[PDB]
C-alpha cells in the first residue's frame, strides 16, 4: 500500500505513521508476529526515552497472533515508565484482546462497534501449551478483576463481546463515541 | 503503479495522493482491508489534528471488504470532530455502501454513473455473523431514515442502485454533475 | 513491514531501528541466519568502534537458527571489548538461549513472561554434529556454572523455562519487571 | 532484511555495511555467487585505490560457492597491492576455506568457534572438473606449506576443522579470542 | 544484494559500481541479456562522451548469453573512439570469450586463474544459426590472428583454456599477476 | 490404498467393501461429499431391493461434510423400508453426528472411544443458511427427544461428547463393547 | 472413490451404478458437464432401446452446470419414448432444477429435505446469453404452468425452495416420504 | 507400487496382501488415516465373520496417525470375538504404539530391532485435546499394568524403546527372534 | 512402467515380477520405504509358508532408505526359517548394503560391476539417532566378522567398494560372473 | 499410451510388448532407470529360464541413464547363459551405447539411420566418479578391441557416430538394412 | 480418453485400436516420441511376423517429433519384408511428412483435406544437427525423385502443401476421395 506523506509544521516530512508516532500513537494492525511485535516494542522504548512522563496510545486492530510475540509487547508495556493506554478499533482477539485488557487500568478504551474476543486458541507438545494456557488465564483474570474460574470458563469460547459487554467483563474501562 | 509527483507552491514535492491529503481528501480504493482501513483511520486522525473545524472528504471506490476493518473507519468518522463528507466514485458496495451512507448527513454525495449496493454478504460460526447482520442493518436504517424492516428486506439482495435510487433510498443526499 | 521514522534532537531522521542502534541496542529477531547474524556482528563491531567502554544491549526474540551463524555472534560478543548485556523478550530458544546465556555474566536479563529453551536440536553427517553437540553443551555448562552432565541432561529436552527457572538454572542473572 | 544506518562523525549517514567498508572491512556472507563475488572484487579494487598501503580485512562467513566466482576474488586479493587479511566467522567451507587460506600469509585469522572445511566438492564434463580439482589442491598446498599429497588426501573428506586444527594444518596463522 | 556506498573526495556519495564507472570501469557480470548488454552499451557511450581519449576497462565475468545482445556490445566497443581494454575475471565463455577477445588488440588481459571458453553453442530455424556460426568464427579468427579453420575446429569444443593457453591461442595479450 | 480381495464361499471374489456390502454394511468414511453421499444412497437403495425386511448397518466415521449431500442420505434412510441401524466408529461430527442420530430409533450405536460432535458449523447468502440451521436443529431435537431450545444451545458449541454423554443426550441408544 | 460391486441373481457382477442402471435408474450427480451430460444421454438412449415402454428414473443431485450440456439431457428426455420420471435428492439448482422440472409431468418428485433453486445465473458476449435467458424462462414457465412474468421474477433470485414450496410453484408434483 | 500376485493351491490368484489376509494377517503400514483405519476395520470384521475362534495377527509398521482413526481400530479389536495378536515390525509410534500395546494381552509381540514410541503428540481447541490426552494415558496404563502417573511421565517424551525396554515397560509380552 | 506378462506352463499368466516370485526371487529396487519394505516382508512371509525349506533369493538394487523400514526386512529375513540369499545388482548402499551383508552367511553375492557403500548417513533428535548408529555398526561388525572399531571407521565415509573389496571387507561371500 | 493387444495362435491375448517378449525380444526404451533396468533384468532372467540355449534380442533406443542401473543390465547379460544380441534403433547414447557395445560379440547390430554416442557424461564426490569413468572406459575398450587410450580420447566427446562409423570403431558388428 | 471395445466374430473382445491392428492398421497420432515410436515399431514387427506377405497400413496424423524416434520407425518400415503403405489424415509435418513420404513407393496416400509440411525444424551442439539436416534432406530427395537442391530449398520453409501439391512434389502417389 502507498503510505501518505504529511508535513509537520515546526518543516518536516513524515509518512503518516511516523507522523502519528510523533504524537505518541503506536499501531498494531493485523496478526501479531515477531516482526510486528518488535516494531511495537521498538516504538514503545523510543517513546519512553523521548518523554517518560507522557502517555502512549496503543491502537489495536488485530485478530490474534503469536503468544511469545504478544508477550514481548505485554512486558514492554508493563516495564516502561509512561502509562500505555489502549484502544480497540475494529477488533481485538486472542492476543489482541489480551494486549487491550493489559493496558493501563483506567485507560483501556474501545470504540462502540468493535468486537472483542478473549478466546485463546493457543495455536509446543501438550504440557508446554498448558503452561501458557494457565499463564494467560491468570493474567486475564488479574486484568479483569475476575476469578480465574471465570476466565477459565470464558476464554474457552470463541464468542465476541460488544464494547459494552467487554466493559462489564472488565477488559475495558470506557467506550468512546466522541 | 507509478504514483506521480506534483509540486505545491508555498516549493514542496508530494506524490499525488499526499498532495490531495493536503486538501483533506482521503481515498478508499479497492477492498477494505485491515491495512487500507488503518490508512484511512490514520489519515482521518491526522486531518482532525491539523484542523478540527475543516471538513474531510472521503472518496469511496470500493466493492466491499472486512466488516471489522470497515467498522474501524466508521467509528473513526463518527468519533473525530470535523464533518466527514463522502463521495461515491464508480461504486460503493457492501461495506463501501455502508461507509458512504455513514458520511455526515447532508454531505453524502454520489457521482451520476456510480452504482451503490447495500447488500451485506457477511463473508465466525453461525450466531456471531448474525450479531453483525443485525448491527449493520440497524445502522443502515438509522443512516437512511428507513425502517429496520426495509433494510432487512433490501440488504438481502445484490441489486445495484443508481445514484438517483440511492438518493431516494436515503443513502446519499446529493448527486454531483458539476 | 513499514519501519517508522523518528527524529533525533541534536535534527537527524532515523528509522526506529537505527535510532535505537544509536542508543547501543542491537536486536536479534526471528531465526538466526547468516544474514541476520552478520547484521548483528556488523552492529556489534560498529558499536565497539564508536565507544569501546560503553555497554551494548543485545535484545533477543528468537526461536533458534543456524549454529555457525549463532557462533559468529557469540565470538563477536566475547571478542569485542565493551560488555554485551543481553535481554530475552518473548523467547529465546536453541541458539537464541545460547546467545542469551552467553551475555556478560551479571548482565543477562529476561522479561517475566518470556520462555527460554536450552534444547539444542542441531538441525553434517553423524560425527560432525556431535562435535557441535559437545561443544555447545560445554559452553552452556560454562555459562551456567553447571556440570557438563546437567547440560547433557537438560539440553536433551524441548521444555521451556520461565524466567525464574532460567535464573535458577543459571542462564540469566536478573528478571526485569520495571 | 533491514540494514541499519549509522552516522559517521567528520556528518555522513551510511548503512552499516558501507560504514564498515569505510574502515576497510569487506564481508563475504553466504554462498559465493557471481554477483557477490563481483561485489567483493569491486570493494577490493575501491579500497586499493583509496589507499594502496592500508590493509583490507576480508571477513568470511560462507558455506562455499562457485569456483570461478571464488577465483575472481582470489586473483583480486593477490593482484591488489595492500595486504588482504582474512577472518573466519562462523564458518569457511569449500571456496570459503580456500579464500580464507588465501589471505596474506601471517594475517589469516579465525574466531575460536568457527569451523573450517577444506573439502572441495567441485559442484563441466569429466576432465574439466579435474583441471580445477588439481589446480585448487595445488594452490591449497601452497597456502598451507603442505605437500600436494596431503591436500589430495584431506580435500577429499567433508570433515570440519576447529580453529586450532586449521592453525596446525596451515590454513590460518592465528586464532582471535580478544 | 546490498550494494555498498562509498564517498568520493572532490564529497559525493556513489554506490560502489557507480564509483568504479567514474574510474572508467564497466562490468559485465553474469549472462549477457538485452538489459545487461544495453547497460554496458549505455556506459560505454557515456564514457566516450566524457572523455574520448581515455581508455575504458571492461571487466568480464560471464558464462555466455544472447548473441545479438553480445553483438551490440561488440559493435559499441569497436565504434566508440577510446580504446576498450578487457579483463577476464573468473571466466569468459561463449559470448563472454568473444567480447574478451574483441577488446583492443594489445590491451586484452586475463587473471591467472580464469578460464576462457571459445565454444559457441549458438543456443532461429537451421540456416539462420549458421549465418551466425560463420560470422562469429570469422570474427574470432580475426581477433586471434588464426585461420578460420582453426576457429572452426576449436569453437566446436566445450574445453576451457587457462590464461596461458588463451594467450598462446591469441584471445588475450597479457596475464596479470600484479 | 490397496483394497484387499476376499473369497465368499457359496466361490466369488469380492473386494473387502463389496464383501461387507453383501452382509448389508454400508460405510461412510471421511467427509460427506456429493459422490460419497450418492454411493451411500446407491447402496441403501440396492440393499432395500435385495431384501426390504433386513436391517442395514450404516457405519459412520466422518468429520462432517456438505449438508445437502448429507440430507440425501438422511432422506434415503428414512424413505427405504428396512430399518437402517447406525454405528459410530472413531467419530461422528456435524453431518456425521446428524446421520448417526438419524438412524432407526433403538438401533443407534456407538463404540466406547468414539467422539460425537453435534455442532453444525454450516460451512448461501445469510438467510438461506439459517433456513438450514433451523431445519437441522429441529430434526436433531426430534431425533434426541430434546427441546428445540436444547439443540439450539448445544449445536452452537464445538464440544465432543463421549459415547455415554451422547447416550444421555439422546443421539445414541446403546454403547457397544462386545 | 471405490465403487462397490454387487451380484445380480439371474450370476452377474456389476458395480453399484451399473446394477441400478439395470433397474432403469440414471444418476446425475454433481455439476453438469459435457461428459456427465453425455453419460446421462447415453444411458437414456440405452434404456429406451431395451424397453421403450418402461419408465426411467432420473435422480438428480446437482448444483448446476453448463446450459448446453443440460439441454442435451433435456432434449433427450423429451425425445425418447418412455416417460422419464425425476427425483430431487439433496438439491437441484440452476440446470439441475431445470432438469428436475422438466421430468414427465405427474412424475416429478422431491425428497422432503431437498432444496430446489430455479435461479439461472447463466455463467457468450451479451445478447447470446439473453437468447438463453429467455429460452430457459419460457421453458420453465411451461413446465410450471406459470406465467413467463413469474419465472422472469423468480429465476432472478438465488433463493431456495423447500420441497413444499417447489410443489406449489409447480416444479414438482409430489414429495416422497416413503 | 506393483503388488505381486501369488497362487493359492486349493487354484486361486491373489495379490500378496489378499493372500496373507487369507492367513488372517492384517497389515497397518504407514500413518493411520481414516481410509487405512477403515480398511483395517473392514478386514477385522471380515475375519471374525469367517471364523470367530481363530486369532488375527495385526502387523504394525507405523509412525502414528489420527487418534479417532486409531480408536476405531482399537474398539474393533476389543469388540470382535477372536483374539487379535499384534506384532511390531520396524516401528510403532504414537497411535501405532497404542495399537500395539492394545493387542490381546499375552500375544503382543515385537521384532528385536523395532523401535516403540509411546509419546502421544496429540496433533480441537485446548480442553478437547486434553480429554483425549487423559483418555489415552489411562488406556495405556491399563494395557501396561502401570500407574497412570507412569504413563503421564513417559508419554510426555519422544524417546524410543527397544523391544526389551518395551517388554519391561509392559507394551509387549514377547520378542520374536525365530 | 508397463510390466510384461509371461506365461507359466503347468497355463497361468503372470506379470514378470510375480512370475519370478514363483521362483522365489524377491526384488528390492530403489529406496527402501515403508511400502516397499512391507512388500518385501509380505513376499518373504509368503515364500516361507509355501516351502520353509527352500532358499529365497533377495535381489537388491537400492541407494538406501528408511532405517526402520529396512529393519523390518532385516528381522523378517532373520526370523523366517529358509535361508535368504542375497544378490547385489548395480548397487547396494546404506540400508541396501546393510540388507545385502545381512543375507545368509555363505550365500551373500554380488555382481562384478556393482558398487557397495556401507556408509550410514542416518537421515529423531540427537541421541535417538545415535542409538541407531551404534546398533547398525554393531550388526554390520557381526555380519562382516570385523571389529566394531572397523565399522565405526568405515561406515563414516561415503566411499564405494568394488565387489572384490566388499568380499575382502566381509560384506559378501562370492562374486558371480556366470 | 495405449498399448495394443494381439492374439497368439496356439488362443492367448497379450499386449504387444508381452507378445514380443514371447519371441525373446526385450526392449529398453528411453532413459535407463532403476525401474526400467530392473524390468530388463527380470525379462532377461525369465528368458534364460524358459530356454537357456536361445538367443535374446535386446533392442535399444535410449539417450542414456544411471550407471548403476545400466551396470545391472550389463552384468545380467554377461551372466545369463544364452547369447544376448543387441540392436540399436534410433539411438544409443552413454549407457545405451555401452549396453549396445556390450552385446554378444558378433551379434551387435544397428539400423542404418541410428546414431551412436559413446560419450560418458557421468552425471558421487570427485574420485568416486573417476572410478566409474575408468571402469567404463576399460570395458568399452575391451568391447571394441581398442586401446584404453582410444576410448579415453573418444568417450570424452559428445559426437555421434553413424552406424558405419560405429562398425569401424568396433561398437557394432553389422548394420541391418533387411 | 475412453477407448471403445468392439467384438470380432470368429467371439473376441478388442479395444478399437487392437481391433484395427488385427486388420494391419497401425496408427501414429500426435507427436513422435520414443514411446510412441516404439509402439509403432513393435506393431510393425508383430505384423511382419504374423504374415510377411501382407501390406501394413500406417496412418499418420502427426505434427512432428523426435528425429531419432522417427528414424527408428523409418528403418523398421524399410527393414520389414511386407510393404508398408502410408496414409495422411489431417496432417503430416516434419517427421510425420518424412514418414509419410517414406512409405512404399506407389502406396503413399493422402486424404484431400490433409496438410503436409516438409519443413524440418531440427529441434545436439551445432554440427551434429547438420549431419541430421543433410541426412534428412537426402532421404527426402530420394523419396520424392527430386534433386537435393530442391529439398534443401523447400524443407527450409514452414509452408503447407495440399494433397495435390504433395502429389506433384512427389511425397505422395495418390489422393483418396473414396
Structural class of chain A: alpha/beta
CATH topology name of chain A, in short, is 2-enoyl-CoA Hydratase, Chain A, domain 1
Shape of chain A: globular
Order of helices and strands of chain A: EEHEHEHEHEEHHHE
Q: What's the β-strand tally of chain A?
A: 8
- How many helix segments of chain A? 7
Task: Give the DSSP E fraction of chain A (strand runs of 2 or more residues).
Answer: 15-25%
Strand count, sense and barrel status of the largest sheet of chain A are:
6 strands, parallel
Distance between the termini of chain A: 29 Å
Largest inter-chain contact set: A-B, 35 and 36 residues
The protein's oligomeric status is part of a larger assembly
Helix content range of the residues of chain A, please? 40-55%
CATH-level-4 superfamily name of chain A: 2-enoyl-CoA Hydratase, Chain A, domain 1
| Cα Rg of chain A | 16 Å
Number of domains of chain A: 1
CATH class of chain A: Alpha Beta
Architecture (CATH level 2) name of chain A: Alpha-Beta Complex
PDB class: hydrolase
Keywords: protease, ClpP, hydrolase
Entry title: ClpP from Neisseria meningitidis - Compressed conformation
Chains A and 10 copies: ATP-dependent Clp protease proteolytic subunit
Amino acid at each position: 500500500y502507498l503510505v501518505p506523506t504529511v508535513i509537520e509544521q515546526s518543516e518536516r516530512a513524515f509518512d503518516i505513521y511516523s507522523r502519528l508516532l510523533k504524537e505518541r500513537i503506536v499501531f498494531l494492525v493485523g496478526p501479531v508476529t515477531d516482526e510486528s511485535a518488535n516494531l511495537v516494542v521498538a516504538q514503545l522504548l523510543f517513546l519512553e526515552s523521548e518523554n517518560p512522563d507522557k502517555d502512549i496510545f496503543f491502537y489495536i486492530n488485530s485478530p490474534g497472533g503469536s503468544v511469545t510475540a504478544g508477550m514481548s509487547i505485554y512486558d514492554t508495556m508493563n516495564f516502561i515508565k509512561p502509562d500505555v493506554s489502549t484502544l480497540c478499533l475494529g477488533q481485538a482477539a486472542s492476543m489482541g484482546a489480551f494486549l487491550l485488557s493489559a493496558g493501563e487500568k483506567g485507560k483501556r478504551f474501545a470504540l462502540p462497534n468493535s468486537r472483542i474476543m478473549i478466546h485463546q486458541p493457543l495455536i509446543i507438545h501438550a504440557r508446554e501449551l498448558l503452561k501458557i494456557k494457565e499463564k494467560l488465564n491468570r493474567l486475564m483474570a488479574k486484568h479483569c478483576d475476575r476469578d480465574l474460574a471465570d476466565l477459565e470458563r470464558d476464554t474457552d469460547r470463541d464468542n465476541f463481546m460488544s464494547a459494552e459487554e467487554a466493559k462489564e467483563y472488565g477488559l475495558i474501562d470506557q467506550i468512546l463515541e466522541n
